[PDB]
Scaffold this active site. Structure first.
Site, short mmCIF file in Angstrom:
data_model
loop_
_atom_site.label_atom_id
_atom_site.label_comp_id
_atom_site.label_asym_id
_atom_site.label_seq_id
_atom_site.Cartn_x
_atom_site.Cartn_y
_atom_site.Cartn_z
N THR A 224 0.96 -1.24 -0.08
CA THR A 224 -0.13 0.07 0.12
C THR A 224 0.90 1.13 0.16
OG1 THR A 224 -1.86 -1.13 1.02
CG2 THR A 224 -1.78 1.29 1.22
N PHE B 213 -6.71 9.40 0.82
CA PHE B 213 -6.69 8.92 2.07
C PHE B 213 -7.97 8.74 2.60
CE2 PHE B 213 -2.33 10.69 1.44
CZ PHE B 213 -1.67 9.49 1.96
N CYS C 190 -7.54 8.12 6.42
CA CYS C 190 -6.09 7.21 6.85
C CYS C 190 -5.66 7.97 8.13
CB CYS C 190 -5.27 7.44 5.68
SG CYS C 190 -3.73 6.37 5.89
#
Ligand SMILES: CC(C)C1=CC2=CC[C@@H]3[C@](C)(CCC[C@@]3(C)C(=O)N[C@@H](Cc3c[nH]c4ccccc34)C(=O)O)[C@H]2CC1
Length: 455
Positions: A267, A392, A399
């Site tokens: 990721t 995000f 995130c």
């Protein structure tokens, strides 16, 4: 009201066979090109709507109207990430508690403390590259993944995967990669109770067992030790939720470390891999990024202050995040009956998928050159409309790792542009492999040292 588009159907199976493909995000992006800003997706027992426009997604990002849904992908990952922050519902007590306890550990201020540990792995990567023989090439995603996994290991739990010392990955990582692969394979696996998947299920339970034992051991050792290593494990054993006064239990700490190790694997390395790819395909952008690196990074090893100064490198990562966000979709549910864009009525519980790569190509926001690598687009954030750029995710379920991931990527990219000139020696043709994340598969370069010392 508008009847929203639907892609081609397969009798009983509806649209299900369109996700029977090794590049589903890219398949879904091509459907978005044809059908536009929203299409419906039916399968025998379910229905979801895929959003692609800043117009509809800015409403879906209204937390008073939509909350994060666990996708089938997240439910599958949950089997080893548990009620960690990433695979928990907003309404689970462990979500809010773990969120209140951990936010200070992931702050832009907390990055000052992680910097030294991050510099230690970045230096390991630069030295690996300085020590290559002439005409030897770099496997970009593999070396970026070594750096990112080691960095979350060291900064989080004071644990050294020592990835730059091995060909074959650490055992924890073997089990984690296989477990994530089983989780992604289960999505398009019809008849999963067929005894042919008995070896998958047996192996799945083993890989889980490996991850739990190694992390529970890390947690036991740390408590038995009494050491106060400035890190996530320490903050999580000592931390208390202001709201409820409670600390996380040992099982929930494990789930958080497993979630972090997933997040910091392909990721995060994806971002560096896509960035270096865009940089070597766009020589005038690389040149400008290298000039900033050289000007700003005047010390043998970079400081936290100098990383904050790598603005054009920051814009390069944002532009890589625009074109190829390495967590490419997230799911929402309508908390109440509501109407999206004045057109499509939704019943409470209805699911939306946000297609982040398609959002990032909305020409109403970015104009006509949306396929072009122009970091300059990010010069003024005040010129960018609300909810246009979502690599995000959104709101309180965004995130938590964003500052960490951008600091490590800025530091590392900066050091790479200072220390090496890059050659796209194979004239690499982009092939995006889809797993839990995206990565430029087979992406290789040569790095000529500028022969600048790290001492
Ligand atoms: C672990 C995190 C980072 C991930 C989140 C994801 C969310 C959306 C996913 C994903 C990109 C993988 C490919 C399928 C896709 C696009 C999806 O719509 N999936 C929907 C719809 C769906 C597809 N196949 C299914 C089978 C059963 C039920 C639903 C589905 C879903 O997962 O729910 C996937 C990547 C992995």
């Amino acid at each position: 009201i508008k009847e929203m588009p639907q892609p081609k159907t397969f009798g009983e199976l509806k649209n299900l066979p369109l996700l029977n493909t090794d590049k589903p995000v890219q398949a879904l992006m091509k459907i978005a090109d044809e059908l536009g800003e929203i299409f419906k997706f039916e399968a025998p027992g379910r229905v979801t709507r895929y959003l692609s426009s800043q117009r509809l997604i800015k409403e879906a990002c209204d937390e008073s109207r939509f909350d994060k849904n666990l996708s089938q992908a997240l439910k599958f990952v949950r089997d080893f990430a548990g009620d960690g922050l990433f695979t928990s519902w907003t309404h689970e007590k462990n979500w809010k508690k773990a969120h209140n306890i951990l936010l200070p550990s992931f702050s832009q201020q907390a990055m000052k403390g992680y910097h030294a540990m991050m510099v230690d792995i970045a230096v390991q990567l630069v030295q690996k590259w300085e020590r290559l023989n002439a005409d030897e090439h770099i496997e970009v995603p593999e070396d970026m993944t070594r750096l990112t996994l080691d960095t979350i290991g060291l900064c989080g739990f004071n644990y050294r995967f020592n990835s730059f010392y091995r060909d074959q990955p650490h055992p924890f990582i073997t089990s984690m990669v296989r477990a994530l692969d089983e989780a992604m394979n289960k999505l398009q696996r019809a008849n999963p109770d067929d005894p042919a998947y008995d070896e998958n299920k047996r192996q799945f339970q083993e890989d889980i067992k490996v991850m739990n034992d190694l992390v529970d051991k890390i947690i036991a050792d740390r408590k038995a030790s009494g050491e106060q290593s400035d890190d996530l494990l320490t903050h999580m054993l000592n931390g208390k939720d202001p709201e409820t006064g409670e600390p996380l239990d040992d099982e929930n700490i494990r789930y958080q470390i497993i979630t972090f190790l997933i997040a910091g694997h392909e990721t995060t390395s994806g971002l560096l891999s896509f960035a270096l790819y865009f940089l070597v395909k766009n020589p005038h952008v690389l040149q400008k990024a290298a000039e900033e690196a050289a000007r700003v990074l005047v010390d043998p090893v970079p400081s936290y202050k100098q990383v904050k100064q790598l603005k054009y490198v920051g814009m390069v990562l944002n532009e890589a995040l625009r074109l190829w966000p390495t967590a490419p979709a997230f799911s929402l549910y309508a908390k109440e009956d509501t109407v999206l864009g004045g057109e499509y009525p939704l019943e409470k519980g209805d699911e939306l998928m946000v297609l982040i790569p398609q959002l990032h190509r909305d020409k109403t926001i970015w104009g006509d050159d949306v396929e072009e690598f122009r970091p300059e687009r990010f010069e003024n954030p005040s010129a960018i409309p609300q909810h246009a750029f979502k690599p995000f995710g959104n709101g309180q379920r965004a995130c938590i790792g964003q500052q960490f991931a951008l600091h490590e990527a800025t530091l590392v990219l900066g050091m790479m542009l200072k220390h090496f000139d890059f050659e796209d020696h194979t004239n690499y043709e982009l092939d995006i492999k889809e797993t839990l994340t995206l990565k430029p598969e087979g992406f290789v370069v040569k790095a000529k040292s500028k022969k600048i010392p790290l001492g």
